[PDB]
């Protein structure tokens, strides 16, 4: 009752259908800002 990447992605998954027609780079902008690899150091 704390972790995610399940219910949200589950439903949002379908909605993602629009993301494929929204803007490729649009989602890549915020991505780089966070850091694909840097996001891997979000452990303990």
């Amino acid at each position: 009752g704390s972790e995610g990447q399940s219910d949200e992605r589950a439903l949002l998954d379908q909605l993602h259908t629009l993301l494929s027609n929204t803007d490729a780079t649009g989602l890549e902008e915020i991505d780089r800002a966070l850091g694909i690899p840097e996001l891997v150091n979000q452990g303990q």
């Binding site: 995610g4 219910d7 949200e8 439903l11 949002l12 993301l19 929204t22 991505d31």
Partner: protein, 50 residues
């Protein structure tokens, strides 16, 4: 057991958000709250599915 509709609400808001660039900012908001989810960001299947 399962997850509250809150997370999905905010999350879906991103994928459901408009084509505007400002909407992207909303994403970082959710991720910032959900670290364990940040992992999936690495794959960014959404970006590779456009």
């Amino acid at each position: 057991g399962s997850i509250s509709p809150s997370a999905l609400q905010d999350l879906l808001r991103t994928l459901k958000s408009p084509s505007s660039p400002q909407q992207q900012q909303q994403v970082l908001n959710i991720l910032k709250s959900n670290p364990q989810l940040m992992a999936a960001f690495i794959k960014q299947r959404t970006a590779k599915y456009v």
